[PDB]
């Protein structure tokens, strides 16, 4: 939730600075890492209940 | 400037035509159709912008 709010607030930038820079790259990487980890957790908990 | 703004509208029209083709071929697909097969794992992926 914190990461996606960061994405909308940083993406509403004024026109001479709306860039694709080092901040956007690591923000997108962080969002994908979060989704990957909370995909792995479901598999782990199902193996636990089995 | 008039022609450039035209070209922007034409590009939007092209994207919407491609979307119409894909989603119409989705919607009119039926059970007991010919082009159906298993594809495991596309419900796991969600890459949308």
């Amino acid at each position: 939730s914190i990461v996606t709010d960061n994405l909308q607030c940083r993406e509403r930038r004024q026109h001479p600075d709306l860039v694709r820079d080092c901040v956007e790259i690591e923000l997108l990487k962080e969002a994908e890492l979060i989704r990957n980890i909370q995909e792995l957790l479901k598999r782990t908990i199902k193996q636990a209940v089995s | 400037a008039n022609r450039a703004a035209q070209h922007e509208l034409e590009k939007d029209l092209s994207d919407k035509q491609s979307a119409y083709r894909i989603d119409d071929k989705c919607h009119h697909l039926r059970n007991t159709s010919d082009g159906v097969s298993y594809f495991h794992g596309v419900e796991r992926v969600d890459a949308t912008v």
Binding site: - | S37, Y38, F39
Partner: protein, 49 residues
């Protein structure tokens, strides 16, 4: 399940801005999980019979 799987993934090659998380995607992944759970329950009833 075959028909729902093909309906899901042929909406993956979509154009750039048209690649939207429509309600169709949510409804289709819920369909996939629902028909999966139906399959496991019917398998267990088969074993009990």
């Amino acid at each position: 399940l075959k028909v729902a799987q093909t309906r899901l993934d042929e909406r993956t090659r979509r154009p750039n801005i048209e690649l939207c998380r429509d309600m169709a995607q949510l409804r289709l992944v819920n369909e996939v999980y629902e028909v999966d759970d139906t399959i496991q329950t019917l398998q267990q009833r088969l074993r009990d019979a």
